[PDB]
């Protein structure tokens, strides 16, 4: 069954699906010459980028989800204290705002990890940052993001730029990705990752979770967290030095390859 | 002559409102010692001071609120020279202008029936008709088989909320329809989901 | 080719396959409103969960596998 | 719509695509008994390896 | 709770470009260059509040390393 | 020998959730927090016996740095 | 003790560019005597002064700008003390530092064409292939049958601007084609459109 004129793997736009008597293998061909989903008896090829899953597919409908960050200055202290251990936004007998001090004492803050408004306490993990004496006044890690559009037909670079320069007021950083979906229809969505300048849509998008029984190979991998039992690497820079500075002049790095040493800088 | 000027008056954009949640986009501070932000919710005669000490972002969201209630939000950046007591007293800060907004109403369903698809020949497939009233976008609708009390809830529609909602793919039988609309906010990850408002009346679908 | 009373990008539970002369691109949709395999010439969307290959797809026939500590 | 002597669960290599009043879910099957694209109404199963995109 | 993923695979994965995800889990890893803000121990990272209990930590951003 | 993988991507990939795999190979890894027990050299890790590795930030039990 | 204070120099947080409209995010005033805010654009050859009454919002929309022309933005609040002549002199204003941005270009159609496949049985479906050169985020394309003296322009394609645009389902009469680009301002409601560019050639749809 096929559109008139179209043949399996033909340049003209059309569709084709039928038998290959000699090979006794079903065949399918759909799409244009440049873009197509072609399935022979041994391989399935999809030229056009494919999106699998839908935004917010596996969310809790009983309760939403949200993220927030807090930073509180919380001691009238003579000496540097030990960082809190209780994951509560007001820590164990620990103030939430900079109090008044006597001349001898000083002020120490902590860059508190991400706060969960629903639980009003530190999300699982992400303990409190190192306590540093507060003197005077106190780039962002690339992350995943999604946005809702009232009436979406295609990717909108202007909308994404307005989004970043409105929420974060600083514009996107490298490897940032934003997915835009039409309000009233999460099924229709567009995703693009910002690298260098402008947005480049990826060749494939997944919205849930990926499970692979075997191995994975890629040119490079970026993720907000990882848990690896065994890791083998020749060189390891710092994230900021690694991505922010191509020459890797500034660093705080380890070098497994060649001479092995520790450099603090 | 040395001084520490107060932060400029906070300017709030339109209040994006979802049930039990809120989103406020404000201006960018300019003073050199801004260390926190706060908002004074006013529901009726009750005032709640919600304070966020995170200056990194320029958007905020109140986690908890009362459904379907008009509010009043006034925000303000505060310097280091402002203490907890001073902030509570609203002394030494520039408070934002008044703004009025109302909360949203969770979706509610009026009816459910089985209708055969108008066709030119043959037995048209059944299509479920449900009338929906409320405030949301891309509300999700589910079903539960009534044969047993342990049957799973199966999603069948996440399209935009309309006065009348139709969808197919429902096997013949009796079902209890469940709805809980969703409404997002500009913020990257904040999504608002209401409770489940199931239909008290069981309905059956047949050819 | 489609099931009667079915249209692409619709909440019905039919199959649609053909040439959309309006946009001059082939179209496809298999599934209900939620779980579907919808393809437009520009982009393909697969709502339902997808599995590729089978377990032990490349297992050695002559010898099995095993682990011990 | 299907090639003659073919069923969604048959071991015969063929094409089968159509509705199922039992579940009202479309069903699609294309391929032999060991290399196939079995699209259950709820889960999409592919046996043969898949290539996404083109190099450059 | 048991959760059904979006993708299941049983052979191997190849990506000419780059793969990005919120977080990663893998038994083994063979890399060439790494740029990371902080490094933890798997036992501490999996456990809640890692910095409460961590065998060895290095903060590359703060140029610090700690061994108990 | 040579083998055919499960599926191949000729461009980049985006995963809004978590990705799990038996083992990972890549050139550049730009993360923000990693939980690792034992780390060897790339070549040493690829070796049959990692005991001959140049460095080891063993953390699961030993929790000590040893440079060979 | 008595003294006068000039408005604090503001900081332009960000500027979003439209090939006819400009959106700027700026800090908030902090002085009581502030009455209005003014801006000083620079075409590169002639300096143009623009001011907007009211200081309620943190954003502005500069209109009537020359497309494909980079501009420099510098402005600040002027209080009741500042006079019109003094404002023109810009002596005591203490304006903000200049910032340079590039103003986008309106869409244009490089060529107009239409081709269709010969068919053994039936009729080849007409299709229109038209190649653009614009940079608008999403553009709409209209058509009008030129055979009649006067016909109403009709939209046929709505979507993202592309090097090549394909659409069909159009009648047989000879047509004239105009193309316009629409770019959404940070505010969802407001959208900046373009002057309609029309292909001088007129062609029959390939039947």
PDB file of N, CA, C and O in Angstrom, chain C residues 21-25, chain G residues 125 166-169:
ATOM      1  N   UNK C  21      -2.208  17.073   1.799  1.00  0.00           N
ATOM      2  CA  UNK C  21      -1.969  18.047   0.742  1.00  0.00           C
ATOM      3  C   UNK C  21      -1.924  19.473   1.268  1.00  0.00           C
ATOM      4  O   UNK C  21      -1.319  20.336   0.624  1.00  0.00           O
ATOM      5  N   UNK C  22      -2.545  19.745   2.415  1.00  0.00           N
ATOM      6  CA  UNK C  22      -2.538  21.103   2.951  1.00  0.00           C
ATOM      7  C   UNK C  22      -1.113  21.539   3.262  1.00  0.00           C
ATOM      8  O   UNK C  22      -0.672  22.618   2.848  1.00  0.00           O
ATOM      9  N   UNK C  23      -0.373  20.709   3.992  1.00  0.00           N
ATOM     10  CA  UNK C  23       1.028  20.969   4.293  1.00  0.00           C
ATOM     11  C   UNK C  23       1.973  20.206   3.379  1.00  0.00           C
ATOM     12  O   UNK C  23       3.192  20.370   3.492  1.00  0.00           O
ATOM     13  N   UNK C  24       1.447  19.385   2.471  1.00  0.00           N
ATOM     14  CA  UNK C  24       2.270  18.636   1.527  1.00  0.00           C
ATOM     15  C   UNK C  24       3.314  17.789   2.248  1.00  0.00           C
ATOM     16  O   UNK C  24       4.479  17.736   1.850  1.00  0.00           O
ATOM     17  N   UNK C  25       2.902  17.125   3.322  1.00  0.00           N
ATOM     18  CA  UNK C  25       3.767  16.218   4.055  1.00  0.00           C
ATOM     19  C   UNK C  25       2.985  14.967   4.430  1.00  0.00           C
ATOM     20  O   UNK C  25       1.776  15.046   4.681  1.00  0.00           O
TER      21      UNK C  25
ATOM     22  N   UNK G 125      -1.156  16.920  -7.088  1.00  0.00           N
ATOM     23  CA  UNK G 125      -1.565  17.916  -6.105  1.00  0.00           C
ATOM     24  C   UNK G 125      -0.669  19.145  -6.196  1.00  0.00           C
ATOM     25  O   UNK G 125       0.557  19.009  -6.090  1.00  0.00           O
ATOM     26  N   UNK G 166       7.107  24.791   2.448  1.00  0.00           N
ATOM     27  CA  UNK G 166       6.255  23.948   1.624  1.00  0.00           C
ATOM     28  C   UNK G 166       4.837  23.976   2.177  1.00  0.00           C
ATOM     29  O   UNK G 166       4.631  23.748   3.372  1.00  0.00           O
ATOM     30  N   UNK G 167       3.870  24.257   1.309  1.00  0.00           N
ATOM     31  CA  UNK G 167       2.467  24.208   1.694  1.00  0.00           C
ATOM     32  C   UNK G 167       1.638  23.930   0.452  1.00  0.00           C
ATOM     33  O   UNK G 167       2.093  24.121  -0.678  1.00  0.00           O
ATOM     34  N   UNK G 168       0.409  23.471   0.679  1.00  0.00           N
ATOM     35  CA  UNK G 168      -0.492  23.157  -0.413  1.00  0.00           C
ATOM     36  C   UNK G 168      -1.938  23.469  -0.088  1.00  0.00           C
ATOM     37  O   UNK G 168      -2.221  24.306   0.774  1.00  0.00           O
ATOM     38  N   UNK G 169      -2.863  22.802  -0.774  1.00  0.00           N
ATOM     39  CA  UNK G 169      -4.275  23.025  -0.537  1.00  0.00           C
ATOM     40  C   UNK G 169      -4.724  24.424  -0.894  1.00  0.00           C
ATOM     41  O   UNK G 169      -5.426  25.074  -0.113  1.00  0.00           O
TER      42      UNK G 169
END
